[PDB]
Design a protein around this ligand. Structure first.
Ligand SMILES: Cc1nn(C)cc1S(=O)(=O)NC(=O)c1ccc(-n2ccc(OCC(C)(C)C(F)(F)F)n2)nc1N1C[C@@H](C)CC1(C)C
Ligand SMILES: CC(C)(CO)c1cc2cc(NC(=O)C3(c4ccc5c(c4)OC(F)(F)O5)CC3)c(F)cc2n1C[C@@H](O)CO
Ligand SMILES: Nc1ncnc2c1ncn2[C@@H]1O[C@H](COP(=O)(O)OP(=O)(O)OP(=O)(O)O)[C@@H](O)[C@H]1O
Ligand SMILES: Nc1ncnc2c1ncn2[C@@H]1O[C@H](COP(=O)(O)OP(=O)(O)OP(=O)(O)O)[C@@H](O)[C@H]1O
Ligand SMILES: CC(C)(C)c1cc(C(C)(C)C)c(NC(=O)c2c[nH]c3ccccc3c2=O)cc1O
Ligand SMILES: CC(C)CCC[C@@H](C)[C@H]1CC[C@H]2[C@@H]3CC=C4C[C@@H](O)CC[C@]4(C)[C@H]3CC[C@]12C
Ligand SMILES: CCCCCCCCCCCC
Ligand SMILES: [Mg+2]
Ligand SMILES: [Mg+2]
Length: 1162
């Protein structure tokens, strides 16, 4: 990693941006290697910028009664902002006085203008120095303003993230992931470049005042007829600005709603494929896209009229200011041309630079105001204590999640070292009681007293990205303690089977790990941490009886025999070792005491154009009208080769100069060509998104596991927004400029076939430099686009584990990890702007040297009369002033076309592509593996199932019970044959095979939507049928407690529901879509014994005969099975009776609960 070459560059080197030479010469030959990227300058590191802004923002909250974020920003950047403003202003004044020097030089070709001929050589020298000063004064000032805008964005992004970790739990309900992503993505590039346009709010009015005086000198009182037209045009554009912003505000809410739904369905794409819900998911996104595209089109029509206003004023402001003057007294051709030159600069300031500057202030101040509101939300109240009486106590505590209280009159007292066991039915408030103790649920009544040290283990196991060892140890590594908790948590057997022991890298969310393996990593993390109080929220959910027995008798009873701890349990064996017993029932304390007293009872462009058939026809239509206007202009112009206009023989060359000055209005695209072009370019974006979303759902699971959450969110938010807003109008601007250059050249090249010869050397010089620069610019843009992903990936994972983050105190670690993501994007983005500034500065210096040669050639060639060389050469250089604008606009088109190629890569991803009368199956030599180069988890598996019977799957956690179920649906690489009632595996299409199954996934899927929409996304059942099923699974009381019965919206993945309520929701789905063969993957994970009767009755009534393959861990669930399959060391054994199964195993028979042993062994 080399140091930045900017920090030791000489004064002249910084001026010409010469320090970018090493990378431009290397990127032209080879691909940019990882060592070519330089380190960022020390001034713009995220650590130093965040501290500077934080110091000023805290001064506002204490000094001023009315804090404003814009005052803190003003106190850090105002003087540098104004320093570059004055140099930018002097570069624009130089542009307005150019016609004073160039206008008199053009007059020296006329032999009548004897006064201009005597001093022509001095005007040429001054003109050359004027060009050089303007070049050296604009570009360094524009780069400095880009630098300031980058620093402001980095400082403010870090403040948002630091505030996020401190948000209260009540205000988290009102904030989704889609709001934060839209807040950051919209400003990721627009904010930096906005500061270069901000100064024209006061530069444009000063340019108008200067230019109006010079035009007054020529046309005494007729000049104001041109000002009255431009004032009316300025009011018109101001009105279109407010009309466009109204449509943009109505569109923001729908984009955030689409982003959250898109993120949810891709995170659990395996559950979507098992249910065969791809078509239903596409329909929901299609309806959201359609509503927001109508607002996008309406904003596009308004923005077209705002953009073409420049081209449609070039003739009507010149004509209106000259016509009253010519009618009273004849005007010569010399004055007509000079007025045209001054009006070009005037139209640019009024119709282009000023409305763009006003719009930037609306966007910038709007975002800073939006950020300030977020920075003032309610914060989490960390009620830490340094010390206590070493005992925990609650007194008459009542809490509300908002007409029923969650808890009421809950009181206990646990001394140091005692064990408290919390028990109760589903939804009784066991998890809420632990939230109250930690302080994430503030009680309305009562009080809490205990020490500030605490450790937590939730039902939902959160796995941070990184190594397994890094998950457990935290910050401080201890060799002795680490090896003890691993052995006590029974993780040694699983770790030894991994490719590289405990050094394997876990993805975000821990997808590659088993259901029960994640629970042990979460538990090992809690016991490794030293604390005074330990909270365990049902950690024995996805564990078999043998592993559960070993952990309970060696981890929580041996290692922590002297530490007070609270555990949630439903087993009656865990209640005997507890000193205190607490029973909960619907928020009220059912019992409190002890157990003893209880026992008393390029190809990219071509593909983009041809994706929509209607885009070709509009482009041909624009070409035919263009040829008709050029032909019309040629006939008129050829016809011209006291009066209102005075023209002489030696002054007739002004006709061509006037034509070139008004060609931008004769060739302007009217609304018959502008609106269809803009309308059709948005339909292309609609088609591309439909394909992109479609190909992601059909991709094979092996491909989808490589992608990251931030990688998908980068393409669906930033790349789609580019194709909707920026590209349609950038293309229109580029096409408009290209037509003007061709039309002006073609007309004058046939009437004077020497302008074309003299304009060749300038054209090829621009094209050769463009090809050289695009070799390296395209690679830096690609690296910058992919550098946004780590920013989005870290933002997603920090919200999913916010509660665990604050409990373990790892906030500083996550802030430092966020700054590395900011610095990685800064390196690529800063290097991209530097080379872009080099190109635009060289494209202007190349224009200058040619003009310097032309000016001196014309003056020396002009002899005693006329002088034709100068007339031709100076005309050609006037055309190249517009070609310079067209070349720079082509770079913007190419930069935005990088998003089109990134979308095309997601589209080209490979695809994975009464029969069951009885439902009997046959498996022959099935071999299953996740990666083709990985180990075979199962191998040579073979068994048969008779129709109507139930099969029980058994085995230790991590043995491969879920792998066998995934192999039936072909969710991984398989090498065998499965036969269902006669048909063959291979012959069937992959879509009819999956429809024969009913599935209950181990990980439940609830998306943001209505209760009825979650139970039935295809809308194929009436509400009478839905309620009938809802009674059989006991969900009626759950739905009625909400304001909308079957209408309530389940936001944030159904966070309103408890853990046991989600299991019943998945059982309802399987009953509704009644199929023959069922694959139930542990449907009673955390259900208490009383609630399990609901699963038991459903299994015998709803699934009358069927072919049920259970995958349960509880012994009670195996009394309803006729056949058994045991998975051990990658092999499947088969048994006919449960009593035979336990006879062979000696250790597993002892772990059986005595309550279950009597019925298992009568
Ligand atoms: C080497 C090198 N390679 N790369 C990638 C960067 C570098 S460089 O930064 O060292 N220099 C150059 O980049 C460089 C510097 C100046 C110029 N100039 C062109 C006209 C001109 O007159 C200046 C003028 C008299 C108008 C005045 F002074 F008045 F303005 N100067 N051209 C330069 N280029 C080198 C080639 C890459 C292509 C080319 C010809 C455009
Ligand atoms: C002196 C006085 C006339 C009033 O005492 C004044 C100065 C001033 C400066 C800024 N902003 C800036 O100096 C910066 C800036 C921020 C945001 C940007 C950006 C530049 O340019 C953008 F448009 F891109 O957005 C560099 C930080 C402002 F906002 C309002 C200001 N006012 C009016 C006053 O009422 C403000 O309280
Ligand atoms: N964020 C929330 N907003 C509103 N109600 C909630 C919220 N979280 C939980 N509830 C409700 O509070 C009650 C108790 O919550 P819950 O976590 O606490 O039960 P539990 O004892 O953990 O049961 P389980 O065995 O399913 O884990 C339920 O009726 C549940 O729907
Ligand atoms: N996507 C994956 N890629 C690679 N290995 C995986 C993947 N998913 C699981 N494994 C590994 O395969 C083995 C078996 O996985 P697992 O689902 O299949 O078993 P299980 O019997 O369902 O466990 P549990 O009772 O915890 O649910 C484990 O070692 C696990 O880490
Ligand atoms: C009738 C005919 C010849 C097809 C026609 C008509 C117009 C109107 C009537 C809208 C002026 C226009 N005008 C336009 O397209 C205009 C486009 N952009 C503008 C921007 C600012 C101010 C005016 C216009 C404008 O008139 C063009 C035409 O070709
Ligand atoms: C940037 C701004 C403040 C610069 C100064 C703006 C004003 C004061 C300048 C700009 C152009 C100037 C005019 C240019 C030409 C003439 C013609 C001359 O026969 C009388 C003075 C007169 C009419 C000038 C008056 C002052 C003037 C209107
Ligand atoms: C350099 C430009 C400073 C003034 C720009 C506008 C100031 C913000 C006004 C806020 C609303 C009254
Ligand atoms: Mg719970
Ligand atoms: Mg499993």
């Amino acid at each position: 990693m080399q140091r930045s070459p900017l920090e030791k560059a000489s004064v002249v080197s910084k001026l010409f941006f010469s320090w970018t030479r090493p990378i431009l010469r290397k990127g032209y030959r080879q691909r940019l290697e990882l060592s070519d990227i330089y380190q960022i300058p020390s001034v713009d590191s995220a650590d130093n910028l965040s501290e500077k802004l934080e110091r000023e923002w805290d001064r506002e909250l204490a000094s001023k009664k009315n804090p404003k974020l814009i005052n803190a920003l003003r106190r850090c950047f105002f003087w540098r902002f104004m320093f570059y403003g004055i140099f930018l202003y002097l570069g624009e004044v130089t542009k307005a006085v150019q016609p004073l020097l160039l206008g008199r030089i053009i007059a020296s070709y006329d032999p009548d203008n004897k006064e201009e001929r005597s001093i022509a050589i001095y005007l040429g020298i001054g003109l050359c120095l004027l060009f050089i000063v303007r070049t050296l004064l604009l570009h360094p000032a524009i780069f400095g303003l880009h630098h300031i805008g980058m620093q402001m964005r980095i400082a403010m992004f870090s403040l948002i993230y630091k505030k996020t970790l401190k948000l209260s739990s009540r205000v988290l309900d009102k904030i989704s992931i889609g709001q934060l992503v839209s807040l950051l993505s919209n400003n990721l590039n627009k904010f930096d470049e906005g500061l270069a346009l901000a100064h024209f709010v006061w530069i444009a009015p000063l340019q108008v005042a200067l230019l109006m005086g010079l035009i007054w000198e020529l046309l005494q009182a007729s000049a104001f007829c041109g000002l009255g037209f431009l004032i009316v045009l300025a009011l018109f554009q101001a009105g279109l600005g407010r009309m466009m912003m109204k449509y943009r505000d109505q569109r923001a809410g729908k984009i955030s709603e689409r982003l959250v739904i898109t993120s949810e369905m891709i995170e659990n794409i395996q559950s979507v494929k098992a249910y065969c819900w791809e078509e239903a998911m596409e329909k929901m996104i299609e309806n959201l896209r359609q509503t927001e595209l109508k607002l996008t089109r309406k904003a596009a029509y308004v923005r077209y009229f705002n953009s073409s206003a420049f081209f449609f004023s070039g003739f009507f402001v010149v004509f209106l200011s000259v016509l009253p003057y010519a009618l009273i007294k004849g005007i010569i051709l010399r004055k007509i041309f000079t007025t045209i030159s001054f009006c070009i600069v005037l139209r640019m300031a009024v119709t282009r630079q000023f409305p763009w500057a006003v719009q930037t202030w609306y966007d910038s101040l709007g975002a800073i105001n939006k950020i300030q509101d977020f920075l003032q939300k309610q914060e989490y109240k960390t009620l830490e204590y340094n010390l206590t009486t070493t005992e925990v106590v609650m007194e008459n505590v009542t809490a509300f999640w908002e007409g029923t209280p969650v808890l009421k009159d809950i009181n206990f007292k646990i001394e140091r070292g005692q064990l408290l066991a919390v028990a109760g039915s589903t939804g009784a408030g066991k998890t809420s009681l632990l939230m109250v103790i930690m302080g994430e649920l503030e009680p309305s009544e009562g009080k809490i007293k205990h020490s500030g040290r605490i450790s937590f283990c939730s039902q939902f196991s959160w796995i941070m990205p990184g190594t397994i060892k890094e998950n457990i140890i935290g910050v401080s590594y201890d060799e002795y303690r680490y090896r003890s908790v691993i052995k006590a948590c029974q993780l040694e057997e699983d770790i030894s089977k991994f490719a590289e022991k405990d050094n394997i890298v876990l993805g975000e969310g821990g997808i590659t790990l088993s259901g029960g393996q994640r629970a042990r990593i979460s538990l090992a993390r809690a016991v490794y941490k030293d604390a005074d109080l330990y909270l365990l929220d049902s950690p024995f959910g996805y564990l078999d009886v043998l592993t559960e027995k070993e952990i309970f008798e060696s981890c929580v009873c041996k290692l922590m025999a002297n530490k007070t701890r609270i555990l949630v349990t439903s087993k009656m064996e865990h209640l005997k070792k507890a000193d205190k017993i607490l029973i909960l029932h619907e928020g009220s304390s059912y019992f409190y005491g002890t157990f003893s007293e209880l026992q008393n009872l390029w190809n990219t462009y071509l593909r983009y154009i041809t994706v929509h058939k209607s885009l070709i026809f509009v482009l041909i239509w624009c070409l035919v009208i263009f040829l008709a206007e050029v032909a019309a202009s040629l006939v008129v112009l050829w016809l011209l080769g006291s009066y209102a206009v005075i023209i002489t023989s030696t002054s007739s060359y002004y006709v061509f100069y006037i034509y070139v000055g008004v060609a931008d209005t004769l060739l302007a695209m009217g609304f018959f060509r502008g609106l269809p072009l803009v309308h059709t370019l948005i339909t292309v974006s609609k088609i591309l998104h439909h394909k992109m979303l479609h190909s992601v759902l059909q991709a094979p699971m092996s491909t989808l596991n490589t992608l990251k959450a931030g990688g998908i969110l980068n393409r669906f938010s930033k790349d789609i927004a580019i194709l909707d807003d920026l590209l349609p109008l950038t293309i229109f601007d580029f096409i408009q400029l290209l037509l003007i250059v061709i039309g002006a050249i073609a007309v004058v090249a046939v009437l004077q076939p020497y302008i074309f010869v003299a304009t060749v050397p300038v054209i090829v010089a621009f094209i050769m430099l463009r090809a050289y620069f695009l070799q390296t610019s395209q690679q830096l843009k690609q690296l910058e686009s992919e550098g946004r992903s780590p920013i989005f990936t870290h933002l997603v994972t920090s919200l999913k584990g916010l509660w665990t983050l604050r409990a373990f105190g790892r906030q500083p670690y996550f802030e430092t990890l966020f700054h590395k993501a900011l610095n990685l994007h800064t390196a690529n983005w800063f290097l991209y702007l530097s080379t872009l500034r080099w190109f635009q500065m060289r494209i202007e210096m190349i224009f200058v040297i040619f003009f310097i040669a032309v000016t001196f050639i014309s003056i020396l060639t002009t002899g005693e009369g006329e002088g034709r060389v100068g007339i031709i050469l100076t005309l050609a250089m006037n055309i190249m002033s517009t070609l310079q604008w067209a070349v720079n606009s082509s770079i913007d088109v190419d930069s935005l076309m990088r998003s089109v190629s990134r979308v095309f890569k997601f589209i080209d991803m490979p695809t994975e592509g009464i029969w069951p009368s009885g439902g009997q199956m046959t498996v022959k030599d099935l071999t299953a593996k996740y990666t083709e180069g990985g180990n075979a988890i199962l191998e040579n598996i073979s068994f048969s199932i008779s129709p109507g019977q139930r099969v029980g799957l058994l085995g230790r956690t991590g043995s491969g019970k879920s792998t066998l179920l995934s192999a039936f649906l072909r969710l991984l690489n398989t090498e065998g044959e499965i036969q269902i009632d006669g048909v063959s595996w291979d012959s069937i299409t992959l879509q009819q095979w999956r429809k024969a199954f009913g599935v209950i996934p181990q990980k439940v899927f609830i998306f943001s939507g209505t209760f009825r929409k979650n139970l039935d996304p295809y809308e194929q059942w009436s509400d009478q049928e839905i309620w009938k099923v809802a009674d059989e699974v006991g969900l009626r009381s759950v739905i009625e407690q909400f304001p909308g019965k079957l209408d309530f919206v389940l936001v944030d993945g159904g966070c309103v529901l408890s853990h046991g309520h989600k299991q019943l929701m998945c059982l309802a789905r399987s009953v509704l879509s009644k199929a023959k063969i069922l694959l139930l993957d542990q449907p009673s994970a955390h259900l208490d014994p009383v609630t399990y009767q609901i699963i038991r009755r459903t299994l015998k009534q709803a699934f009358a005969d069927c072919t049920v393959i259970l995958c349960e861990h509880r012994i009670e669930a195996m009394l309803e099975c006729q056949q058994f399959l045991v998975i051990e060391e990658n092999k499947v054994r088969q048994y006919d009776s449960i009593q035979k199964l336990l006879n062979e195993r000696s250790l597993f028979r002892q772990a059986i609960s005595p309550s279950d042993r009597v019925k298992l062994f009568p």
